[PDB]
Symmetry: C6
Subunit: 288 residues, 6 copies
């Protein structure tokens, strides 16, 4: 919805957004939204995401698809009305994204998802890309484990000529929806086949906001299938714009750079990562 501000309430908003990244306990936002989600009546639509065609499928708090749901509305504070309706397994009325309010008045944040190696990491969409064919897959997995911390991270596999990899976009969105509804740390191996269909376009444009709102982080691998020309600069450009955080390779072996958006209108931070390979290509991110 829309929000109103004057100098005073605006300053409070900024302090709150600043705290959402810098001082809140890492992962607390995710814990909070998990709470909001479980307090939702069973069968109640909570998430809508677009499939390849352009239509959208809807899920309940347990990541189960909703096939039929009689039109229901809700009058928000802003005065705006929200309407959701599912007919034949497709949203008849509604919008894409979260169908229940997880944020409230606190919007424009990059909720800290975790802390590692002396650095806080934001939730939302994290794109790992750069000078093609490098080691993006090992990096997203190391990041997944690291930010997972005490928890296991979820792995969504898509569009690669390797065994067990799903190649159907609709199964893919089904996997992403379930992951964001149930896990704080998510890895997507290859956006390669997403970059274009309407469903695919709806994905780059929604994933980050959905994740940031939930308080979960989605770490996506994106190899510039294109040349190794300066098209990678175009990819890096597009990525920086649709990501909460960007991670790109450097000229130095095993070194990556992390560019983070700490929040709406807030300062963008940058820090470096040093890595090394172990047995069977397991990558380790050096801390202290």
């Amino acid at each position: 919805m829309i929000h109103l501000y004057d100098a005073k309430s605006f300053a409070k908003l900024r302090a709150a957004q600043y705290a959402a990244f810098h001082t809140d306990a890492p992962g607390s936002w995710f814990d909070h939204t998990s709470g909001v989600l479980e307090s939702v009546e069973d069968g109640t639509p909570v998430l809508a995401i677009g499939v390849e065609s352009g239509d959208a499928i809807v899920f309940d708090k347990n990541a189960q698809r909703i096939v039929a749901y009689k039109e229901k509305s809700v009058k928000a504070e802003d005065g705006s009305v929200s309407v959701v309706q599912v007919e034949n397994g497709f949203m008849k009325q509604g919008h894409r994204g979260w169908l229940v309010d997880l944020t409230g008045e606190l919007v424009g944040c990059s909720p800290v998802v975790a802390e590692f190696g002396g650095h806080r990491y934001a939730s939302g969409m994290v794109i790992v890309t750069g000078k093609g064919n490098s080691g993006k897959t090992p990096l997203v997995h190391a990041l997944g484990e690291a930010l997972g911390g005490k928890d296991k991270y979820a792995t969504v596999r898509f569009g690669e000529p390797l065994s067990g990899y799903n190649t159907d976009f609709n199964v893919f969105v089904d996997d992403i929806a379930r992951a964001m509804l149930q896990h704080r740390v998510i890895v997507i191996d290859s956006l390669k086949n997403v970059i274009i269909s309407r469903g695919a376009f709806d994905l780059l444009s929604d994933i980050g906001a959905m994740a940031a709102s939930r308080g979960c982080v989605v770490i996506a691998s994106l190899n510039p299938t294109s040349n190794d020309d300066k098209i990678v600069e175009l990819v890096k450009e597009a990525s920086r714009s649709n990501s909460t955080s960007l991670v790109i390779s450097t000229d130095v072996d095993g070194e990556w750079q992390v560019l983070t958006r700490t929040g709406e209108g807030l300062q963008r931070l940058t820090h470096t990562l040093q890595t090394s390979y172990g047995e069977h290509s397991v990558l380790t991110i050096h801390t202290s």
Copy 2:
């Protein structure tokens, strides 16, 4: 509708348009149209805006969507007939934009929306853009607060990978319509995802005229997602053409330039803005 002129009536028109920006009390036009809007019979369609598909949704003076409205016509002075009809929540007959006359014979104006730092600001569409990834978000908010003056400004959030940000174009237009119907100062954070669908195309082409007619100002952030090449010059070009006022960054830190169209065929003014950051990235525009 169409208007006729001879040397004399044309001169009066120009003087009136000139006064609408230079001498009228800042924000008086907005107060006037608020008056015209509240004098409209309840349920009467007053605003039509296009959604993604190309169809248009219609709103009444209270920013509530109209689902069904039996065909009704009106014979204007010009002799032209206006017809509006809403069927199944969509305009069956009518045109996009204001469905009730707010302007009358006084057209081609850039109604002064506010005065700040010794400069008058026009209503309509104000695009803030330039040398990418600068500080456009902090600037649109500082401008919003400044032009809001005694009033709070409204904030429409769209297409950014940050918490609580809507990413559905149809919710976005619903937010814009409500904002223009109820507030004099509006901020839109990111046209990034609007630049293309038919609904999106209808937006760049209508927003400015709708706002200028209402007497409200829409301050939109537009980061050249493109390279940092001279594509930003193309963006600045496109922006200057579809905006009532343009605000672009300079080579000098914190300095922005404001280019204003004071009215139909009238002189275009330019003035500079000096800014500085405070705590939590709150930006302040220096006055005296």
Copy 3:
């Protein structure tokens, strides 16, 4: 329809076309077609123009839209048959343009619309363009007043972010049709948003012939929204091809050049215009 010629009848045609611009009394052709139009039976379709979709709306001699009209045909001299039918406010059968014969055997003319400053001006489409962001709006208005002479000129406003400006293409064509049916001198402020939909494409391709046939002049502003590169040369190119007359800016302040097509296969004339601004940007074209 088609016409046949031999050396003799061809020479008579050329003399007649030559006279239509060089010797006829300025504006006489418009007076003549007004006569043909009012002698048409009420309700009889006289003009068809395309709307955005590609379909066409039809008007009667009083500029009122025709919603339903039972199929009717007419056998021309050429042996060709004309058929018109309107169903549900749209042409079921017919063609775009004038539905009644205004020209007869006298075709290929640029009927003199007016005389001013020692120069005759042709009817049809007049495009004012050139080195972007100059002063095209003040110029089309000064031209409108000047060619209007003793009469008021009509002003069609479209696609600009200023108050009261219509942005719906269908309202726009409705405005153009009414203007050509009722006034000799017409001004269109901004073709900016017309340059593309089928209706818009049908416009550039028809307007000039419709105007020239009626004997009215349509003066359209066209700012090269594009860069200030040599794309303006492309715009000037396209304009010269779809216009009866072209008016472009020069390197000299206030100076414009007028390029006129005096008729089918006839010589193209060129003359210069000197201008200056008065109060409130009212532009004056210097005569003697």
Copy 4:
């Protein structure tokens, strides 16, 4: 249909095609096909041409459109079957082009349409183009009169901002069909708006074959609306390929070059034309 050959019958074919241009009496082929056309049963479809949409309208020997015609077939020598059916004023079954056999075994000819200034001219499509904005209109008319000889030439006007010029593609094809069905020499002023819709595409691809088969000549003006760059070379290229004869301007004032295809696999001739203007831009082609 298809034809079979061996060295002997092939040689006879070539001699016959050679004679069709070099030795037959100018215009005899047209006289012959007029004979075949009038011997056709009334109401019988003889010509199908595509309209803008892609569908095709059908005409009888008197150039009257056929609205309904019950399916009828014909078994050709080749063993191939021809079927024609018109439903609701549109070809339900059939192909574009002549629906009755005008050529027979004699195909691949460029039937001499006329003789003038010591040169024979071929029937079919003649495109007049070259270094833009020159004097193409005066030239097509002079050519029309000259090749018309004792007869009047027909003039089809289309897509120009001059009085009485039709701008509807469907009226245009109706004009072309009637012209080819009733006249040996045809002039089309401006293919400008044809170069693209399916109907328009069907036109460039059919006109020449239709004309050549009838034995009539279609002289079409084509100004390279494009720049004056070497895009005119592209236009000249495209034109040479879809024309039976090409006429282009030279660096010498009033001088044009005529490139003629004398027939299938036959030698292509070239000759020059000298011209001068008289009163009211009437152009004269110098003979002796």
Copy 5:
């Protein structure tokens, strides 16, 4: 269908393919498939080819179109099932190409179609192209006569502005189907208008395989309507890829080069052709 191989059966396949071009009696394969075709039950679909829309028409062994044919299936050795069904003159079920097995286990061949001047020529698609506007038409005809030998060659005419030339793609495919079903040597004058609709695209992709399977040769003229730049190199590139044999012009007058694909994975041969013109442009290919 699919075929299985081990070193031994693969070697036999290659020897057989090698013999199909190098040692079989010229034209024997065509005689063999004629035999397979006439042994087919009357009315049985044998060939499917795509029309402009994308749909396909079906023919029986006598080149007569099939309008209705009740679904029928066949279980192949490979275990794959073949299904054919024609409803309303269009393939309801089936695939494009030959609907009856002409090849069997012997696939990947370029069956020798004829022998001339000390060189064997392959069946399939032969594209004659190169440095535009040369003498491609005379060459395809001389080749047709030469490879026809004791038999007459068939000539399919399409897309040229000459008398009797069909310009409807659907008549064209009807002509090609009939030709391949009844003649060993076929000439297609101009693929010019085929290079794009779905039917046209299906043609370049099928013609060669259809011809090679039948054992007939299709000699197609293809003039690079494009510039005379190095776009002809692009055309020559595309042609070499979709042809069984390529014939291109050289810098030497009357000299052409023949590049032949002798079979799947087999050596590509090249030989030169010397030609000269006789009376009425009849071209002769020099042998001894």
Copy 6:
């Protein structure tokens, strides 16, 4: 589905994937999936692949198409539900790819398909391409025989102007599905006509994952029909991205380079191949 990991389970996954290529007995994975496939209830859908339109056809374990199959669902461990339904020979519900689980928890592998010349080869998609018109066909066949070892390899022929070559995309996918369901080593001669329709696009994006999951290898020929410019670099680029293994030609005659992806995030190996031709172009790959 999605999988969860922590440092420990991730390390086990990598060791398992590493073993799937480096230590498992060559071809064991294929033997295993054959086992899973035959244990499937008859009539049960096991494979879905897209046809040209975009729809998908479904096959049972015996490579027979399924025309009708009543909706049935399955609840996976991940909590995700799988649904399959076939109506009128087309998937009403389901996704493309394997419809039965062949991999389980072991995903991201490049199962060793065979061993030859001292090198292990991965299953999945192997693209053979490079400096056009070289000897790709002989190479894919030699590779097929070599990796087939004791077994025969299957050959799918498509899109070449040679006898018996299918040119219908739907027959092609039918051939690929059958091949992967019944053979460990598959050869596809020419992807030339696949590079674009939706079905074709679904192919490049699925084939590798389908093959890798089955444990079979698909060796596809891909000649850069494009120029011999550096577009082949683009083709090689695209190929490396959608292939499990890439095989490209070098500047050295008969020498090819093999680039293999050994698994998810694992090291990419490279080795060279030396070849020579024997009789009838049978190519031999040199071992010791």
